[PDB]
Design a protein around this nucleic acid. Structure first.
Lengths: 236, 148, 187, 348, 55, 106
RNA sequence: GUUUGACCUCAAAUCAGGUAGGAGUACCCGCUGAAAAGCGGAGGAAAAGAAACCAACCGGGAUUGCCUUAGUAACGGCGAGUGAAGCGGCAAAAGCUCAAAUUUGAAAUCUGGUACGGUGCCCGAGUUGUAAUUUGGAGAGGG
């Protein structure tokens, strides 16, 4: 097809944008990790929290291993993904949008959050949400795979999947075990999409999301966090 | 207002543009019946200066007549056809060697808009019923020859 | 049906016979992208609906309600303008920085003068194609004309550059073929 | 003439066939061969006119969206009347005991949907309502603590409870992620869902008011975060039939993280005992401790038990599933792990 | 300009100190007639909020 | 001036109380939604399901019940061996049975 | 994009609300018309009616009817005979409305439905122009 002369300009400028911001992030995180703070924006990082203009409260990051659940949100309007973010997402398996996963939050995991910030959303989940997620969603690799890992998992000592909830919430013994065991995850699209009544909801959540999600492009961007209890109440 | 431009463009009828419009519209009406409804006046300036208003209760009929007066007879045709409507006035729009084409303005005295808006409530009186029959229209008075 | 036959027979004889050059100025109209950006420009300058008008009216009336009311002065509104005699009125001032003229009007004589009028007056007129779409952008069924006079500073450069564009695409391209008899080929 | 073709009936009513199916389910009209007189009763119904004006509303919404004017469409959406089911609920089941008799089926569908995951067709709001109302009714059952018959199964958990003395059969399939079947069509179950939801909603209104407490049951948000169940709701104010009600009185349990929390905590609440799950302890603020000395019973299904407290009795959950079925205590020696169990055949 | 047809050559006029546009370039097509068509459909091409001129 | 006159017409109307403020109207709707929704006026033992014996007939003729028609199969594959409390296969059949029951009602 | 949607046009309604006929016809208004008849249309009256008028004055001042003008002017095998009008006295007296230039700092207009001639809300009609203002006696804009 004759594609157009216009969308190319949008995607090219949006790539220049994504490339400059991710480069700035790389500078800042490399200098911070190497502990060479001579001329930079800030020495420590921040976490933003939007709750119900709506109140937005910010905190300093704690070097504490914290449970999070990533939800991938549709990327910006006209962007093709840069390869760095592509590799991070492939490692986290966030391709095939409307895809989430549980993640440990430590200082080594932390810098990548700015890498993938304009493509995801963060927040603090509750056990009720996690329980609803797993007991209503979640599948495992096809055929004997699903069985054999359950044996290996039993060698680690887990049974009765509710205990997978208990360990994912506890993180006491082995999260990466359960994390790899829940390798695929999927969520419905909150709006059925095409249709007279539906298009109103598409537009309304477009406006609501534009109010919520914020694209700093600063490299000192506070980590945006949302109440996942509401996000999954919508999406599950 | 643009209606002036309509008036003086109508002034030059035998010009190329308006003769072309004459010659297309004569054919297009020829496919249609002897009598039928128009959605909108084809000469809105003429309709206004004859008293047209674009609202509910103003009906436009296009009438075809073979070559009394032809305009008066054309008015009488719609007079019989639309008894409920009251004939306000007519005017010339188009013609052919076989037929002449006229546009007539009729007003309904039943629609509350005409019954209200005291500018036009006067036509609701029973004495104005079938003006064309008694030659009380513009062509009726002209043929009767009533002036000073 | 009779009228399907008539409307399919219509537009055949018009091209069968020679249309006057004052016509066929129509349908030599704006190209795809340029109409598209013209409409994107206009969609920022939609007029207020009757519904929105009544919402703001009741809002401000309620604002007057309070004891302890609030009194303020507000700037001018900005919107396209669309009524035919009003459109010609903004011409002969002049005030129209742009005018769009729909091609399909059953009484075409309502509009035949507008291209020549704006040509001689120098208003940057354009022949848009379809009165219904003008109706869509103006809270009407149909408009047949769309004039704009006052534009915010945030679009003024866009307006001027679009004016130069339409001068490049319409006045230059089609003036010599505005200048010939169209049609006349049998169907 | 006693039989009218479905096309004939739907065209005479001037409706969409899917909405005709909705109405037929909605008023309990049964047969492409339908009674002429029932359809005559179906000529005049406010709900039918409301559906038709919803069709016109959708058309006007398409009109607005094609015109690009969003604020007007918002006005229409907000200024929209909603068809209610309430009238034919009352004129279909005037006698409340008949509604009690017919709630048997109504409970089942909504419980299934409370299990069901979110999908593109099934809105998450629908499931939220389903689980909310189901937990409300379960809390109601827990209030007076009057159930007598207990069952365990691959096909659900059939519990049968007396309400107003009328004995009612409901089930809850276990909270497991189900593979959604493509064979089914949700357009039927969604109508049944709405009808049953409104039915049982008003039934719960009358039951809660008859029991003399506030109908909308408040819940502590953090307690809900501990667990999404009947225990989340606190039931306000404004004897029990022996032996099953107040069975195991002054009795305190220690349900494990190994055990299925849902059905067991429901059963203990029906017994009136206390429920303590370490699955709740690891997130509930502070606590993380056995703060109650009274605890002397564990429900657990494991071969090896670590602390092996002699003072605490160790039981597999079938014990609770048995005593209530018998309404009487039984020895736990068979129920002590890892002892083999008797085949428990429930009394139906 | 490949979609109009295979082109022999393409270049854009370029600044030395810093990589920013001089906004004009040269093309070269295999066939002159194809070159005529591309010029004809592009001589006044409104694009990205301003018009393009090809000769 | 005419918009001002219309505004002052609305003002006198609200001053008399003929028109309710939109904020108060939304308050009334919010209360009235709640108020309106407020006021109103045996084969299981033939089936085994807990380490019982009868379903030891289930694997014996499993091929046989498989060979029947579907409308026989669902009822014929209700019965399956219950191992212990730990595992529940996960209700592949129940949703289909409820859908069929809904159609039977319809 | 083979989709979907804007219009325009047209149909169909056992959809809602209204409206025409027919009798009579003394008077009135149009069409036709011989040696009047007929047709069409009302009303309590109708028609006409506020100058593209009459006049030549020292000018008058919508229309209508009566007296006079007058059996005069004019017409007519200038034969049969046909046959006015200005003005004046009197009766009664009435003047108004559009269409032509923008409200564009907000179609401000109105039918219909519905809940209580009016008010609210909603469909619509309408910019291919409904409202306000202006009909030459001026009128408009402002200070």
């Amino acid at each position: 097809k004759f594609v157009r002369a216009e969308s190319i300009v949008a995607k090219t400028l949006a790539t220049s944008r994504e490339k400059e911001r991710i480069k700035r992030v790389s500078i800042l995180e490399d200098k911070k990790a190497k502990n060479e703070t001579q001329h930079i924006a800030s020495g420590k990082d921040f976490i933003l929290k939007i709750t119900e203009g709506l109140i937005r409260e910010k905190t300093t990051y704690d070097g504490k291993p914290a449970l999070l659940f990533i939800v991938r949100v549709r990327g910006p309007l006209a962007v093709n993904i840069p390869n760095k973010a592509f590799k991070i997402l492939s490692l986290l398996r966030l391709v095939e949008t409307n895809t989430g996963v549980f993640v440990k939050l430590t200082k080594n995991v932390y810098p990548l959050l700015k890498v993938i910030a304009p493509y995801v959303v963060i927040g603090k989940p509750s056990l009720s949400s996690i329980r609803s997620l797993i007991q209503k969603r979640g599948r495992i690799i096809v055929l004997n795979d699903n069985n054999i890992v359950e044996e290996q998992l039993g060698d680690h000592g887990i049974i009765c999947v509710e205990d997978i909830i208990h360990e994912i919430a506890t993180m006491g013994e082995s999260f990466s075990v359960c994390n790899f065991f829940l390798q695929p995850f999927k969520l419905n699209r909150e709006v059925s999409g095409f249709g007279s009544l539906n298009r109103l909801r598409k537009i309304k959540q477009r406006e609501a999301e534009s109010r919520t999600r914020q694209f700093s492009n600063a490299a000192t961007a506070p980590v945006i966090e949302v109440d996942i209890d509401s996000l999954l109440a919508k999406l599950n | 207002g643009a209606y002036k431009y309509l008036e003086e463009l109508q002034r030059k009828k035998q010009s190329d543009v308006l003769r072309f419009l004459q010659r297309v519209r004569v054919w297009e009406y020829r496919q249609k019946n002897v009598i039928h409804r128009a959605a909108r006046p084809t000469r809105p300036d003429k309709a206004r200066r004859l008293g047209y208003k674009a609202k509910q209760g103003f009906v436009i009929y296009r009438v075809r007549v073979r070559r009394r007066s032809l305009r008066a007879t054309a008015e009488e045709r719609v007079g019989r056809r639309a008894a409920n409507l009251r004939v306000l006035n007519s005017y010339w729009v188009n013609q052919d060697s076989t037929y002449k084409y006229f546009e007539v303005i009729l007003v309904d005295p039943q629609h509350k808009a005409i019954r209200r808006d005291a500018r036009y409530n006067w036509i609701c009186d029973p004495v104005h019923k079938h003006r064309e029959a008694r030659g009380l229209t513009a062509t009726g008075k002209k043929s009767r020859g009533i002036n000073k | 049906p009779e009228y399907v036959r008539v409307q399919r027979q219509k537009k055949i004889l018009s091209i069968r016979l020679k249309v006057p050059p004052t016509i066929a100025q129509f349908q030599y109209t704006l190209d795809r992208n340029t109409a598209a950006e013209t409409f994107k420009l206009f969609n920022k300058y939609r007029p207020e609906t009757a519904a929105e008008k009544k919402e703001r009216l009741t809002k401000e009336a309620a604002a007057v309600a309070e004891g302890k009311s609030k009194q303020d002065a507000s700037p001018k509104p900005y919107a396209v303008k669309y009524g035919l005699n009003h459109v010609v009125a903004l011409i002969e001032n002049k005030k129209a920085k742009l005018v769009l003229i729909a091609n399909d009007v059953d009484p075409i004589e309502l509009v035949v003068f507008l291209p020549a009028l704006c040509k001689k007056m120098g208003v940057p007129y354009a022949i848009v194609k379809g009165k219904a779409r003008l109706g869509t952008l103006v809270n009407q069924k149909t408009s047949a004309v769309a004039a704009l006079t006052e534009v915010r500073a945030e679009d003024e450069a866009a307006l001027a550059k679009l004016v130069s564009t339409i001068d490049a695409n319409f006045a230059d391209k089609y003036d010599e073929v505005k200048k010939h008899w169209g049609g006349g080929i049998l169907g | 003439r006693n039989f009218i073709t479905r096309s004939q009936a739907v065209r005479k009513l001037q409706v969409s066939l899917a909405d005709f199916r909705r109405l037929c389910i909605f008023k309990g009209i049964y047969p492409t061969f339908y009674y002429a007189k029932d359809i005559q009763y179906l000529m005049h119904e406010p709900v039918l006119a409301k559906f038709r004006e919803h069709k016109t509303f959708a058309r006007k919404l398409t009109r607005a969206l094609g015109r690009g004017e969003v604020s007007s469409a918002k006005r229409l959406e907000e200024n929209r009347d909603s068809y209610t089911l309430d009238h034919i609920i009352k004129e279909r089941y005037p006698s409340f005991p008949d509604a009690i008799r017919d709630i048997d089926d109504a409970l089942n569908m909504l419980f299934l949907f409370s299990n069901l995951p979110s999908t593109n067709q099934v809105s998450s709001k629908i499931i939220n309502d389903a689980q909310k109302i189901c937990n409300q009714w379960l809390a109601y059952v827990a209030k007076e603590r009057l159930v007598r018959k207990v069952f365990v199964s691959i096909k659900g958990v059939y519990y049968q409870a007396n309400i107003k003395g009328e004995e009612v059969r409901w089930l809850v399939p276990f909270k497991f992620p189900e593979n959604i079947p493509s064979d089914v069509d949700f357009r039927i179950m969604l109508t049944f869902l709405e009808f049953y939801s409104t039915l049982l909603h008003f039934v719960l209104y009358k039951l809660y008011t008859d029991s003399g407490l506030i109908y909308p049951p408040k819940l502590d948000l953090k307690k809900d975060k501990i667990i999404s169940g009947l225990s989340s709701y606190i039931l306000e104010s404004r004897k029990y039939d022996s032996p099953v009600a107040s069975l195991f009185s002054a009795f305190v349990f220690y349900v494990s993280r190994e055990v299925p929390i849902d059905i067991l905590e429901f059963l203990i609440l029906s017994c009136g005992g206390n429920v303590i799950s370490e699955a709740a302890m690891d997130q509930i603020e502070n606590k993380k401790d056995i703060d109650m000395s009274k605890v002397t019973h564990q429900i657990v299904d494991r071969p090896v038990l670590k602390n092996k407290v002699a003072g605490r009795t160790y039981i597999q959950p079938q014990w609770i599933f048995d005593c209530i079925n018998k309404g009487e205590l039984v020895p736990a020696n068979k129920y002590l792990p890892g002892e083999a169990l008797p085949p428990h055949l429930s009394p139906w | 300009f490949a979609q109009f047809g295979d082109l022999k050559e393409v270049r854009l006029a370029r600044n030395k100190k810093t990589g920013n546009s001089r906004h004009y370039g040269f093309l070269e097509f295999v066939n002159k007639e194809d070159a005529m068509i591309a010029q004809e459909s592009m001589n006044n091409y409104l694009l990205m909020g301003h018009l393009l001129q090809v000769r | 001036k005419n918009e001002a006159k219309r505004v002052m017409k609305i003002v006198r109307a609200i001053r008399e109380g003929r028109i309710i403020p939109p904020k108060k109207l939304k308050e009334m709707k919010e209360k009235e939604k709640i108020e309106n929704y407020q006021y109103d006026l045996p084969p299981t033992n033939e089936e085994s399901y807990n380490p019982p014996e009868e379903y030891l007939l289930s694997p014996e003729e499993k091929e046989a019940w498989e060979n029947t028609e579907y409308s026989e199969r669902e009822r014929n594959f209700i019965p399956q061996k219950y191992s212990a409390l730990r595992k529940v296969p996960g209700y592949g059949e129940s949703i289909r049975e409820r859908f069929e029951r809904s159609l039977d009602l319809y």
